[PDB]
Design a protein around this ligand. Structure first.
Ligand SMILES: NC(=O)C1=CN([C@@H]2O[C@H](COP(=O)(O)OP(=O)(O)OC[C@H]3O[C@@H](n4cnc5c(N)ncnc54)[C@H](OP(=O)(O)O)[C@@H]3O)[C@@H](O)[C@H]2O)C=CC1
Ligand SMILES: CCCCCCCCCCC[C@H](O)CC(=O)SCCNC(=O)CCNC(=O)[C@H](O)C(C)(C)COP(=O)(O)O
Ligand SMILES: [Zn+2]
Lengths: 133, 198, 339, 114, 118, 385, 83
């Protein structure tokens, strides 16, 4: 068990569905010996010996830049897309859509209240769940 | 409602023009506040000249220096706002002359014009870091002998960075980085609703 | 346990609750210092009056140090001291076996009961302290007894770290001050004229950090580290060097240890903390064991500190009106004899 | 750009002043270690002056350098006289504080925020 | 006569800050948003730059929060984005400015909702 | 030129003053006072506190004169708000303003003598002081450090009966001042150690910003209380005690004379204090009465906001100076529209006076320096702030 | 033990403190004291609650004892009122 942090406890980046990258700020220092997710893996790499290049988070932000653009530019949706070539490959792909109806897993609101880890661990969400049930 | 005496508002305004005409060169703004106080504002170079005229002019004798202070507006390019408040025992009146100084652009010293400033100028250097040329002996007055940093600057932490305790091992008082046992609770107090200016 | 949070200084937490029974003395003053600096919870059992224990209060944050009334002839007192500690450090020792406590008690008897209880309590580690070169067949009843105990302590708290330090010098040291204190005796009586007496001195701080580090280090379990020093010395240079920094004349005078054991007996006779003792004398003229294989201070992280470096601070009080202003580097450092 | 000068028109002239101060401290270190009965070595002390002098070696701004010596000179005066009792001087040596490692692995093992 | 310097006023050497808190402290220049609780907008006017948050461990004796970071409670207020950026550069703190986001104009008219059509 | 630190812990030196001195023989060649042994941050701390929670700092700035200092901040905050206290509160502030002047002078004259070596005057007048403290306590709750004079008037009306006792005392205190005179005013020896010691010219006193008895002692006629009246010190009638041949003895005589003149001002205040309220009626600036906040919603809201957030003074800056017992005490309070101040330089009559120690004690013996620190009433709280 | 049952525990590193010195806890815990308070019966739909003594009580609030289903409880005194 290598405990990590949560988004209230680290200056990490996330991106929503239309690719707008956004930055969580550290509201509270992570608890116990728990540490930021990126460092645990930089440290494991040092013990392993295949050390990762970055050693400070600005450096990891620079790393994100080389693999991907959105990650470094915040609050900035990426305008152009290439739908036409996407279709060409879709046309090549042949698959059968089975007759089974497609159903969202969250059919009613009790479905919604507890999903992720933090949610599941919620006493307030649990009280909400029993109120519905 | 305070007992304003317009008689004053006018007389001090009139002096404000008087000074503005007498020293067109250094006076940038002059205004008599609604609180019945004059606050000539001078270019930093006019420190010596504007004070001297006020200390030694028959129609404006401002013999004693009430205070020399430096507000620090971090936003303002010229961070410090040296303010000199002066009194006239003859005309029973006062005026404040305020200049602007940046961290590394020193102001002249007026110890010549008023020797009262010998200490206050040392106080402004120690707290804010403005430097005063031609000062007889500028050296920290209020802060500790080895203090690093100018304390009243808005960019200096209240608690500071060093605190002192006695260590037995070394049998001598010893600085250590500040570790506070209940941090200053920073209550946010500004209300999101303003007051329609009268 | 106590997860260690903080930046590392006072008002921070390290999670080491540690009973330290002999804190009142010379080394304790140092053991509590680091433990308090680190932020550890320190319970200091005391039987000295509250006025004397005050120097301890200043070291450590509000609530770090707790003082408990304790009597050696009462097992219950040791019981409650280790109730809530997870580290027990034993520094109980004396040079003059007193009317109601003989060397066995101070070294072997008591330090056993203590670790014994500590186990019952479930303390993670115990660090007994016995003298270096405490051969089970050494000349001084003290060294013999101290060895006897280390045998016993291993039974009660198997693998309780044990540290055997070499002569310890630091302000208020015996090793360094005592010699400087022979001034009253115009000449200095030294067997073999101060030769045939190789000794390695260790600064009090060095020993301490090691001890503290031993508590926070895993490797220490079941070890017998022997904090020794950075350089050995024939007792001759040591004595003169001391007198050198003290800037007081030196007349090393040969006197049979036979007759001298008698001088120790004389002071030993004195009621108030004999200035010197039969045993101390023997211990003095007892050479220090070789490096052997036992691990050392640097092993526990604290690189030893040469004697000459801090000697100036320990011996300064003994200088005169003017000699009080001389510094060590204009002074001549004595030669090192490893033998 | 376009900045008024304090005591030195160019870094060159300014450096002259730094040389003087260095000398001053260099000549003073021994005296302090004796008038304050400090437990340090003159060679060690001069090293400290060097370190402190070097710590700011990067600066290339004429105005910043001039203030730095003004401040430096003021420190000297205090130390020259006994205004700064030993506690004050020894603080320069950071003798009691425990040094912090700068190795990443080291910090990881100890502090949440490095 | 004035002298020329192209060196970004850096005065990190005069401010008197410990080395650790000048090279490891990231400050963010942001215009404060409004607690959704209140509808007043007088606290969303001036830009503020705030230093990065640091350790707040519980105190063992009384349970009070304890902090080892001196620049924590310090939030300086600057009237314009340009001036705040300048403070970071000369003091040597790293900065990551966030553009002000002001509510977009919204068209409202009491008559519009009375429309049964829609 | 022997160098010697007068020493922080000097039985004579008030509080803690390191007066490094170079003494040719016993004569003092140079006097370089060191300050800041009591700097505590009072000016920076205030920026982080609301106006009402910074009022207690002013009592601590120069605590011999506990209240008179509070009046200076009060006045300053009232000016910025353009609010003025109710009539009864004004008289109170002048009543306790003067009582405080006596308290300071009893401190200055008797502590001066203790350093000189006369010890019985201190015990004689500290008993009178004690009796005065009790007024403070029965009005504020604290013997000293009251917090009674707040920015909009005083906090609570006088207890029902205080005025009568501030009379009995005043009716007698005179004799107590009279007794001390006998011993010192004309002692064949007080005069010697005090006369012609630390003479300060008139032009030099204005130049070094002395602004206090120190100016008045040199013959310059300036009492900010007559020249620029504050509160209702205008409606009373008192005589400034100007001095000639300004020297330690003359100024002393002046301080004994203001003790006398303050009894004249106190008498009047007791004779003519008006029926009325003791705090402005603007719940905006003054906290609502507790019966009102517990029965009226607008009063609770005003109580909650005032205590939790603050006055919200309109943006501006003012330098208001009163005549604190030591001299001109002024607060330059710059203020943004916020409830907490932006700057509050406290002008301390004392920062200027100490500076003069050098120009006063020249070619003087070690004992002379002790006499001159006394004739400046240096309270290191105001100087160090 | 205490109101909110503070229980430095058998394994805590803080229970060390009480050794040889007692802990501060409260008898007549308040949690149960108002529960011990009788329900103030009233005639009117709404009732006041000065806390008792006016100025020496709590800011006066009016409680709606309108449903016997619930005895209004002034948020300040915890006094239940029985319609
Ligand atoms: N520096 C040295 O001389 C060396 C010391 N050591 C060992 O290190 C340990 C610490 O040394 P140091 O501090 O100089 O020794 P001290 O003589 O200073 O005594 C150490 C502690 O033991 C306590 N103690 C002694 N006798 C008794 C007793 N009968 N009952 C209860 N407590 C007692 C003392 O408390 P109190 O005085 O209040 O009773 C004191 O706090 C010693 O145990 C010694 O064996 C090892 C090598 C060299
Ligand atoms: C033991 C005794 C204690 C005494 C300690 C002492 O008082 C404290 C102290 O030294 S305070 C040091 C500050 N001293 C400066 O700040 C000088 C900086 N001088 C420059 O920056 C130059 O302009 C230059 C650019 C040429 C440097 O370049 P270079 O690499 O040195 O060559
Ligand atoms: Zn109620």
């Amino acid at each position: 068990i290598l405990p990590g942090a949560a988004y209230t406890e680290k200056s990490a980046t996330y991106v929503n569905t239309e690719g707008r990258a956004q930055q969580t700020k550290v509201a509270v220092t992570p608890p116990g010996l728990a540490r930021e997710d990126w460092k645990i893996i930089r440290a494991l790499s040092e013990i392993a010996g295949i050390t990762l290049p970055y050693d400070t988070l600005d450096q990891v932000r620079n790393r994100l830049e080389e693999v991907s653009p959105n990650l470094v530019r915040y609050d900035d949706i990426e305008e152009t897309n290439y739908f036409q070539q996407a279709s060409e490959l879709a046309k090549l792909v042949n698959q059968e859509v089975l007759a089974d109806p497609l159903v969202p897993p969250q059919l009613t609101i009790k479905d919604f209240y507890m999903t992720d880890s933090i949610s599941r661990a919620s006493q307030t969400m649990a009280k909400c769940v029993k109120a519905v049930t | 409602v305070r007992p304003r005496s317009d008689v004053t508002h006018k007389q001090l305004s009139a002096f404000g023009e008087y000074v503005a005409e007498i020293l067109p060169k250094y006076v940038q703004q002059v205004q008599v506040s609604c609180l019945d106080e004059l606050e000539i504002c001078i270019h930093p170079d006019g420190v010596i000249p504007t004070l001297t005229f006020l200390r030694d002019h028959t129609n404006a004798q401002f013999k004693s220096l009430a205070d020399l202070t430096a507000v620090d507006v971090p936003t303002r390019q010229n961070r410090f706002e040296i303010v000199y408040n002066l009194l006239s025992l003859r005309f029973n009146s006062r005026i404040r002359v305020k200049t602007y100084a940046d961290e590394l652009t020193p102001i002249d010293s007026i110890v010549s014009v008023h020797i009262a400033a010998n200490w206050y100028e040392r106080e402004v250097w120690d707290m804010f870091g403005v430097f005063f040329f031609n000062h007889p002996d500028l050296r920290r007055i209020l802060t500790d002998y080895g203090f690093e940093g100018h304390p009243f600057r808005k960019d200096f932490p209240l608690t500071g960075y060093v605190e002192l305790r006695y260590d037995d091992e070394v049998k001598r008082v010893v600085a250590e980085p500040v570790e506070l046992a209940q941090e200053f609770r920073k209550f946010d107090l500004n209300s999101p609703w303003e007051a329609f200016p009268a | 346990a106590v997860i260690p949070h903080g930046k590392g200084g006072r008002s921070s937490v390290s999670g080491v609750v540690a009973t330290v029974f002999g804190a009142t003395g010379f080394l304790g003053r140092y053991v509590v210092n680091h433990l308090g600096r680190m932020g550890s919870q320190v319970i200091i059992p005391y039987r000295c009056d509250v006025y004397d224990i005050m120097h301890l209060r200043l070291m450590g944050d509000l609530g770090q140090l707790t003082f408990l009334e304790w009597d050696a002839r009462d097992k219950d007192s040791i019981r409650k001291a280790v109730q809530h500690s997870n580290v027990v450090i034993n520094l109980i020792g004396r040079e003059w076996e007193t009317r109601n406590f003989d060397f066995e008690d101070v070294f072997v008897n008591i330090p056993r009961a203590i670790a014994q209880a500590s186990k019952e309590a479930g303390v993670e580690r115990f660090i007994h302290v016995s003298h270096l070169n405490a051969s089970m067949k050494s000349s001084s009843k003290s060294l013999r007894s101290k060895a006897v105990g280390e045998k016993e302590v291993r039974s009660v708290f198997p693998e309780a770290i044990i540290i055997r330090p070499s002569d310890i010098f630091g302000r208020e040291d015996r090793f360094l001050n005592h010699f400087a204190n022979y001034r009253w005796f115009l000449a200095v009586p030294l067997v073999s004229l101060g030769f045939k007496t190789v000794k390695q001195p260790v600064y009090v701080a060095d020993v301490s950090k090691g001890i503290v580090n031993a508590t926070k280090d895993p490797d220490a379990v079941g070890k017998t580290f022997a904090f020794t020093g950075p350089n050995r010395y024939l007792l001759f240079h040591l004595v003169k060097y001391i007198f050198g920094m003290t800037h007081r004349t030196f007349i090393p005078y040969p006197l049979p240890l036979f007759v001298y054991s008698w001088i120790g007996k004389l002071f030993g006779l004195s009621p108030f903390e004999p200035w010197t003792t039969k045993d101390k004398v023997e211990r003095i003229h007892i050479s220090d064991v070789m490096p052997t294989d036992l691990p050392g201070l640097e092993d526990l992280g604290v690189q030893p500190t040469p004697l000459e470096l801090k000697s100036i601070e320990v011996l300064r009080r003994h200088r005169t009106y003017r000699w009080l202003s001389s510094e060590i580097e204009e002074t001549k450092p004595a030669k090192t004899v490893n033998y | 750009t376009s900045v008024k000068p304090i005591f030195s028109r160019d870094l060159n002239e300014a450096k002259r002043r730094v040389r003087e101060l260095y000398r001053a401290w260099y000549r003073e270190v021994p005296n302090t270690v004796h008038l304050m009965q400090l437990d340090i070595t003159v060679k060690q002390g001069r090293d400290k002056v060097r370190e402190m002098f070097m710590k700011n070696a990067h600066v290339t701004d004429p105005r910043v350098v001039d203030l730095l010596v003004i401040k430096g000179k003021m420190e000297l005066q205090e130390t020259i006289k006994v205004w700064k009792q030993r506690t004050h001087v020894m603080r320069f040596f950071h003798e009691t504080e425990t040094p912090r490692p700068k190795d990443f692995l080291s910090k990881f093992y100890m502090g949440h925020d490095p | 006569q004035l002298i020329t310097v192209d060196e970004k006023l850096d005065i990190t050497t005069l401010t008197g800050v410990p080395e650790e808190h000048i090279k490891t402290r990231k400050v963010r220049i942001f215009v404060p948003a409004r607690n959704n609780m209140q509808s007043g907008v007088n606290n969303t006017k001036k830009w503020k730059m705030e230093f990065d948050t640091r350790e707040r461990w519980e105190n063992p004796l009384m349970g009070w929060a304890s902090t080892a970071d001196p620049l924590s409670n310090m939030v300086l207020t600057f009237s314009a984005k340009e001036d705040a950026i300048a403070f970071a550069e000369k003091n040597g703190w790293s900065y990551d400015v966030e553009e002000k986001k002001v509510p977009k104009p919204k068209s409202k008219s009491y008559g519009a909702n009375f429309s049964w059509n829609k | 030129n022997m160098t010697l630190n007068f020493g922080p812990q000097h039985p004579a030196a008030h509080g803690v003053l390191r007066l490094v001195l170079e003494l040719s023989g016993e004569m003092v060649r140079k006097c370089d006072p060191h300050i800041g042994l009591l700097h505590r941050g009072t000016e920076k701390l205030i920026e982080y506190k609301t106006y009402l929670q910074a009022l207690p700092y002013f009592d601590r700035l120069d605590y011999v004169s506990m209240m008179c200092n509070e009046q200076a901040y009060s006045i300053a905050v009232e000016k910025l708000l353009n609010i003025q206290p109710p009539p009864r509160a004004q008289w109170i502030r002048v009543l306790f303003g003067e009582i405080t002047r006596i308290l300071n002078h009893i401190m200055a004259v008797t502590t001066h003598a203790l350093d000189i070596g006369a010890m019985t005057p201190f015990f004689w007048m500290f008993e009178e002081r004690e009796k005065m403290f009790e007024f403070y306590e029965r009005v504020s709750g604290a013997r000293m450090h009251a917090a009674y004079i707040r920015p909009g008037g005083v906090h609570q009306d006088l207890p029902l009966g205080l005025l009568d006792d501030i009379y009995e005392f005043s009716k007698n205190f005179s004799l107590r001042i009279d007794e001390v005179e006998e011993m010192l005013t004309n002692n064949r020896i007080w005069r010697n150690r005090t006369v012609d010691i630390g003479v300060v010219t008139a032009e030099d006193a204005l130049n070094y910003g002395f602004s206090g008895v120190m100016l008045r002692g040199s013959g310059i006629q300036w009492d900010l209380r007559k020249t620029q009246p504050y509160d209702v010190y205008d409606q009373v009638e008192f005589d400034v005690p100007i001095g000639s041949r300004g020297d330690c003895y003359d100024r002393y005589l002046c301080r004994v004379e203001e003790m006398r003149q303050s009894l004249r001002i106190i008498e009047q205040c007791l004779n003519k204090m008006p029926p009325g309220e003791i705090k402005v009626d603007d719940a905006k600036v003054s906290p609502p009465k507790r019966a009102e906040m517990k029965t009226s919603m607008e009063s609770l809201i005003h109580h909650f906001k005032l205590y939790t957030e603050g006055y919200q003074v309109p943006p501006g800056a003012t330098y208001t100076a009163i005549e604190a017992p030591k001299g001109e005490f002024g607060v330059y309070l710059v203020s943004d529209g916020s409830s907490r101040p932006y700057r509050c330089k406290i002008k301390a009559p004392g920062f200027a006076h100490l500076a003069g120690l050098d120009k006063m004690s020249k070619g003087h013996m070690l004992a002379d320096v002790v006499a001159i620190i006394g004739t400046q009433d240096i309270v290191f709280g105001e100087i160090d702030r | 033990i205490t109101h909110t049952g503070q229980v430095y525990d058998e394994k805590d590193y803080r229970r060390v403190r009480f050794v040889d010195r007692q802990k501060e806890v409260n008898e007549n815990f308040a949690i149960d004291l108002i529960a011990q308070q009788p329900v103030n019966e009233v005639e009117h739909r709404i009732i006041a609650c000065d806390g008792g003594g006016g100025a020496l009580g709590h800011p006066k609030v009016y409680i709606n004892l309108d449903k016997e289903t619930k005895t209004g409880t002034c948020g300040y005194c915890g006094l239940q009122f029985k319609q």
